[PDB]
């Protein structure tokens, strides 16, 4: 129903496309099928070579915190954790660092970053942590910078997952072992998404990935309107490849492809894993595609366009003239692949300190009745296995960080489970960072780290230790992983119990939370014995040494929440995860654009901590809001260009031009130096519009007491537009826009009204 436009190279890949075209033009049918389907190798996936032309096997490798399965590398903080920095410089630098390590391990294509699938419709999503903000605008800037940093290191990106992949449950990878297939049991969950919602929420971050020059995009496991993502013509050929003007390849999820012919006709470029994983995740092209070309049902012109999309990245990143080194680790594992591993160390100086700065910039202060910052306390108590090592080793949970037992004390939660985890060379534990600082103050320190419910004597030891401590730290965690959603907000392990004991025996409890998402702390958050509360997300290998300096006030906290923290799972979008045994499971996105905070705002629900909330050790006062209509500029800077239709198109201009700039002033009005994330929210007029939508942020660094700084927010045409289902285009409405500036999504003291002319 929607025809596949041919690739032409767009803006920045013109010469790379031309080499890709000339190379493909000399290929046999048997060669075209080789490069478009996966083969057996050491990496997550591997394209077939075209050996007659000197095109090698491309190594495709997970994942969104760095190369997975690999020794000799670093464990970076997750996307969640960089999001909470609200710092553009760090978002870029992390991706550049990941890229360096991908390149040096010999990866051609990184299966990274996550750029808005999952976006955040449900805060229970098992792999929400792999992405960044539950907000299209901020997820969009984060995705732009993440793709830029990876591509600038010389690795091709595969941005994922396209699209509306918002729950793990019933995602239902294609699996066929013993002749019984997943198709005989249950189809994938189907996101039924209206067109306005697709344009204004889910496509937004992908447009940014495309503009930043993402080389490839991964389709998703879910169906959309009862059509598989990997063979959805409206999705791939029309929305992605026509409207977003995407010039790269679509890569299948591993078990994302369910058929041979529709996938070919409808926009898929690469079948993965192909012959990897014994063929059990389907092997629908390869020789079957040769047959389909030669027997006439799939055209050779169509398949050539797939190969050109694959080769465009190869030539634009200069992998022909500067090939990556060889890839030496078996990341698949026996019995699936029998193959020894080499060894390579790629950790560069500077990487560890970068990982620590992202942790120190993201730790988010939620409550502080005056216990923080610490001074030089003499007697410190520490609770929870989250304060120390996994008792079986940092990497004991295996190549996907998901094979340890349900009750294992996994230690500090530095990453989540699944394809987006990575190995850690060590873990810097909160306990050891705390002890180091205790020794400097000549203090004492003791930690109870066992399970408080099941270890003989643990409850007594807690009761004897806590009453004489000046401060007691409670470390809590909540592991989640790809493949399942969290059943609710409950804390992991014995957390509930550690809290019940902590508040019973101590009056100065400081809680620290390592987590993949929102958790339930309602029983304790208003207890006056809990004097402070911090969420550190998934900080990677520098867990303790990033946190402790914030606790002791060497650096004031400046992280803010990148999603909403509701009091109950009941306060979020209804039917966040659908559980059914129907053969055709359905998820209807009837909420439309109202997910996360925009659902809270429209329903008049008050969260415990709102989107964009974080405390500091000082306070900031906002003043002098200026809307400068004189400060406009053409968009010149993008790597690639969309073909997104809009009403004000004149043949030269762009949906992404800056049409005006907004300024405000902040003043440090407390007693310490501190950083501040300023945020700008826009109320677009129209019917059934979000109360307010984030459209800017700007983080001021280390503003001294009594000093002032100007904060600046460039507003693009698209930032102030709506999508017209009837006209099929973006337009700026006439009407009153409200513009608000402040320190969180509910704390906005500056406001003004803009009416277009």
Ligand X SMILES: *[C@@H]1O[C@H](CO)[C@@H](O)[C@H](O)[C@H]1NC(C)=O
Ligand Y SMILES: *[C@@H]1O[C@H](CO)[C@@H](O[C@@H]2O[C@H](CO)[C@@H](O[C@H]3O[C@H](CO)[C@@H](O)[C@H](O[C@H]4O[C@H](CO)[C@@H](O)[C@H](O)[C@@H]4O[C@H]4O[C@H](CO)[C@@H](O)[C@H](O)[C@@H]4O[C@H]4O[C@H](CO)[C@@H](O)[C@H](O)[C@@H]4O)[C@@H]3O)[C@H](O)[C@H]2NC(C)=O)[C@H](O)[C@H]1NC(C)=O
Ligand Z SMILES: *[C@@H]1O[C@H](CO)[C@@H](O[C@@H]2O[C@H](CO)[C@@H](O[C@@H]3O[C@H](CO[C@H]4O[C@H](CO)[C@@H](O)[C@H](O[C@H]5O[C@H](CO)[C@@H](O)[C@H](O)[C@@H]5O)[C@@H]4O)[C@@H](O)[C@H](O[C@@H]4O[C@H](CO)[C@@H](O)[C@H](O)[C@@H]4O[C@H]4O[C@H](CO)[C@@H](O)[C@H](O)[C@@H]4O)[C@@H]3O)[C@H](O)[C@H]2NC(C)=O)[C@H](O)[C@H]1NC(C)=O
Ligand U SMILES: *[C@@H]1O[C@H](CO)[C@@H](O[C@@H]2O[C@H](CO)[C@@H](O[C@H]3O[C@H](CO)[C@@H](O)[C@H](O[C@H]4O[C@H](CO)[C@@H](O)[C@H](O)[C@@H]4O[C@H]4O[C@H](CO)[C@@H](O)[C@H](O)[C@@H]4O)[C@@H]3O)[C@H](O)[C@H]2NC(C)=O)[C@H](O)[C@H]1NC(C)=O
Ligand V SMILES: *[C@@H]1O[C@H](CO)[C@@H](O[C@@H]2O[C@H](CO)[C@@H](O[C@@H]3O[C@H](CO)[C@@H](O)[C@H](O)[C@@H]3O)[C@H](O)[C@H]2NC(C)=O)[C@H](O)[C@H]1NC(C)=O
Ligand W SMILES: OC[C@H]1O[C@@H](O)[C@H](O)[C@H]1O
Coil, strand or helix: which one is 44?
coil
Binding of ligand X by 588 (CB under 6 A): yes
- The residue written with tokens 């945020």 in the block is 679
- Whether the upstream peptide bond of residue 265 has omega within 30° of 0, thus cis, is no
Which DSSP helix (H) or strand (E) runs through 33? helix 29-35
Min CB(494)–ligand U separation in Å: 8
- Residue 727 site contact among ligand Z, ligand X, its own copies, none (CB < 5 to 8 Å, cut-off depends on kind): ligand Z
- Of 271 and 298, the one with the shorter C-beta distance to ligand W is 271
Binding of ligand Y by 169 (CB under 6 A): yes
What sign does the dihedral 116-117-121-123 (CA atoms) show? negative
Binding of ligand X by 8 (CB under 6 A): no
CA end-to-end distance (rounded Å), the chain: 41
- Residue 435 site contact among ligand X, ligand U, its own copies, none (CB < 5 to 8 Å, cut-off depends on kind): its own copies
- Residue 426 site contact among ligand X, ligand U, its own copies, none (CB < 5 to 8 Å, cut-off depends on kind): its own copies
Binding of ligand V by 324 (CB under 6 A): no
Q: Catalogue the long-range contacts made by 10-13 (C-beta closer than 8 Å, 24 or more residues apart).
A: 10/245, 10/247, 10/640, 10/641, 11/638, 11/639, 11/640, 11/641, 12/213, 12/316, 12/639, 12/640, 13/213, 13/247, 13/312, 13/316, 13/640
Min CB(339)–ligand U separation in Å: 24
- Residue 49 site contact among ligand V, ligand W, ligand Z, none (CB < 5 to 8 Å, cut-off depends on kind): ligand V
Binding of ligand Z by 234 (CB under 6 A): yes
Q: What residues between 444 and 503 interact with ligand X by CB under 6 A?
A: 503
Binding of ligand V by 269 (CB under 6 A): no
- Of 19 and 228, the one with the shorter C-beta distance to ligand Z is 228
What sign does the dihedral 339-156-227-9 (CA atoms) show? negative
Binding of ligand Z by 194 (CB under 6 A): yes
- Of 254 and 622, the one with the shorter C-beta distance to ligand W is 254
- The residue written with tokens 């059934």 in the block is 688
Binding residue for ligand U (CB under 6 A) from 333, 467, 487, 706? 487
DSSP state letter for 468: G
Binding of ligand U by 333 (CB under 6 A): no
Size of the residue set binding ligand W (CB under 6 A): 8
Binding of ligand Y by 460 (CB under 6 A): no
Q: What residues between 693 and 752 interact with ligand Z by CB under 6 A?
A: 725-729
- Residue 404 site contact among ligand U, ligand Z, ligand V, none (CB < 5 to 8 Å, cut-off depends on kind): ligand U
Binding of ligand W by 228 (CB under 6 A): no
- Of 125 and 390, the one with the shorter C-beta distance to its own copies is 390
Min CB(613)–ligand X separation in Å: 24
Radius of gyration of the chain (CA): 26
Binding residue for ligand W (CB under 6 A) from 7, 46, 70, 111? 111
Dist CA 111 CA 219 (whole Å): 12
Dist CA 135 CA 138 (whole Å): 6
Q: Identify the CA nearest to 211 among candidates 657, 562, 652.
A: 657
Question: Pattern 412-451, binding to ligand U, x per CB under 6 A?
Answer: -----x----------------------------------
Binding residue for ligand V (CB under 6 A) from 51, 226, 336, 623? 51
- The residues pairing with 110 across neighbouring beta strands, listed in sequence order, are 61, 157
Cβ partners under 8 Å of residue 534, min gap 6:
363, 364, 365, 366, 510, 511, 512, 513, 547, 550, 551, 557
Binding of ligand W by 482 (CB under 6 A): yes
Question: Pattern 10-39, binding to ligand V, x per CB under 6 A?
Answer: --------------------xx--x----x
Min CB(192)–ligand X separation in Å: 6
Question: Pattern 123-162, binding to ligand W, x per CB under 6 A?
Answer: --------------------------------------x-
Alpha helices in 227-299 (DSSP H): 233, 261-265, 287-294
Structure tokens at 446: 């003791």
Dist CA 355 CA 546 (whole Å): 8
Dist CA 475 CA 499 (whole Å): 10
Residue numbers at the binding site for ligand U (CB under 6 A)? 169-170, 397, 402-406, 408, 410, 417, 479-480, 484-485, 487, 492-493, 579
Which residue ranges make up the site for ligand X (CB under 6 A)?
A: 192, 288, 291-292, 295, 297, 503, 505-507, 527-529, 586, 588
């Amino acid at each position: 129903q929607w025809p596949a436009p041919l690739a032409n190279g767009g803006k920045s890949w013109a010469s790379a496309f031309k080499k890709a075209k000339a190379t493909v033009t000399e290929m046999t049918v048997e060669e075209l099928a080789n490069i478009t389907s996966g083969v057996i190798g050491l990496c997550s996936g591997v394209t077939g070579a075209v050996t007659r032309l000197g095109i090698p096997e491309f190594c495709l490798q997970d994942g969104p915190i760095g190369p997975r399965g690999v020794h000799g590398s670093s464990q970076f903080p997750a996307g969640l954790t960089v999001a909470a920095t609200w710092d553009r410089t760090l978002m870029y630098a992390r991706a550049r660092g990941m890229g360096q390590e991908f390149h040096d391990q010999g990866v051609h294509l990184a299966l990274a970053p996550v750029t808005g699938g999952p976006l955040g419709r449900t805060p229970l999503n098992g792999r929400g942590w792999e992405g960044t903000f539950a907000d299209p605008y901020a997820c969009g800037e984060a995705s732009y910078l993440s793709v830029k940093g990876l591509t600038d290191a010389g690795v091709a990106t595969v941005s994922k997952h396209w699209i509306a992949y918002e729950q793990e449950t019933s995602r239902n990878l294609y699996i066929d072992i013993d002749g019984v297939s997943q198709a005989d049991i249950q189809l994938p969950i189907s996101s039924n998404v209206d067109d306005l919602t697709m344009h204004e929420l889910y496509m937004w971050s992908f447009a940014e990935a495309v503009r930043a020059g993402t080389n490839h995009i991964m389709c998703s496991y879910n169906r959309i309107n009862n059509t598989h993502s990997c063979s959805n013509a409206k999705g791939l050929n029309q929305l992605l490849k026509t409207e977003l003007n995407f010039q790269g390849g679509v890569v299948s999820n591993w078990g994302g492809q369910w058929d041979s012919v529709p996938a070919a006709e409808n926009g898929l470029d690469v079948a993965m894993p192909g012959k990897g994983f014994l063929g059990a995740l389907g092997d629908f092209w390869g020789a079957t595609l040769v047959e389909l070309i030669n027997n006439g049902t799939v055209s050779e012109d169509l398949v050539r366009d797939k190969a050109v999309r694959i080769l465009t990245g190869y030539y634009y990143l200069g992998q022909d003239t500067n090939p990556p080194p060889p890839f030496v680790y078996n990341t698949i594992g026996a019995p699936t692949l029998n193959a020894t591993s080499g060894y390579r160390n790629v950790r560069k100086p500077g990487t560890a300190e970068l990982i620590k700065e992202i942790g120190s910039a993201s730790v988010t202060l939620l409550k502080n009745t005056g216990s923080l910052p610490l001074k030089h306390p003499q007697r410190i108590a520490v609770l929870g296995n989250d304060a120390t090592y996994n008792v079986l080793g940092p990497n004991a949970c295996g190549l996907a960080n998901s094979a340890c037992d349900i009750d294992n004390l996994n230690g500090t939660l530095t990453t989540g489970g699944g394809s987006g985890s990575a190995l850690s060379p060590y873990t810097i534990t909160p306990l050891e960072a705390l002890q180091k600082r205790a020794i400097e103050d000549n203090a004492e320190i003791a930690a109870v780290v066992a399970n408080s419910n099941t270890t003989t004597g643990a409850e007594d030891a807690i009761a004897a230790l806590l009453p004489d401590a000046d401060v007691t730290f409670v470390f809590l965690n909540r592991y989640s992983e790809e493949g399942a959603d969290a059943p609710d907000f409950s804390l992991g392990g014995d957390g509930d119990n550690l809290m019940d004991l902590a508040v019973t025996y101590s009056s100065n409890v400081v809680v620290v939370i390592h987590t993949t998402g929102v958790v339930d702390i309602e029983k304790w958050a208003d207890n006056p014995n809990v004097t402070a509360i911090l969420v550190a997300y998934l900080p990677g290998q520098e867990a303790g040494n990033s946190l402790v300096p914030v606790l002791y006030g060497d650096v004031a906290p400046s992280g803010k929440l990148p999603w909403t923290w509701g009091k109950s799972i009941d306060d979020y979008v209804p039917n966040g995860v659908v559980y059914t045994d129907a053969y055709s499971p359905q998820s209807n996105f009837t909420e439309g654009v109202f997910i996360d905070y925009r659902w809270f705002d429209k329903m008049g629900i008050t969260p415990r901590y709102e989107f964009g909330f974080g405390l500091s050790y000082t306070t900031f006062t906002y003043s002098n809001l200026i809307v400068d209509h004189g400060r406009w500029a053409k968009d010149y800077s993008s790597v690639m260009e969309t073909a997104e239709p809009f009403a004000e198109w004149d043949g030269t201009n762009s949906l992404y031009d800056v049409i005006f700039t907004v300024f405000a002033t902040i003043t440090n009005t407390g007693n310490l130096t501190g950083s501040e994330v300023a945020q700008l929210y826009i109320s677009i007029p129209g019917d059934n519009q979000p109360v307010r939508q984030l459209r800017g942020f700007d983080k001021i660094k280390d503003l001294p007491v009594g000093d002032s700084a100007v904060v600046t927010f460039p507003i693009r045409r698209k930032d102030v537009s709506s999508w017209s289902v009837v006209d099929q285009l973006w337009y700026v409405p006439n009407g009153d826009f409200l513009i608000s500036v402040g320190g969180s999504s509910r704390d906005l003291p500056l406001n003004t009204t803009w009416t277009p002319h």
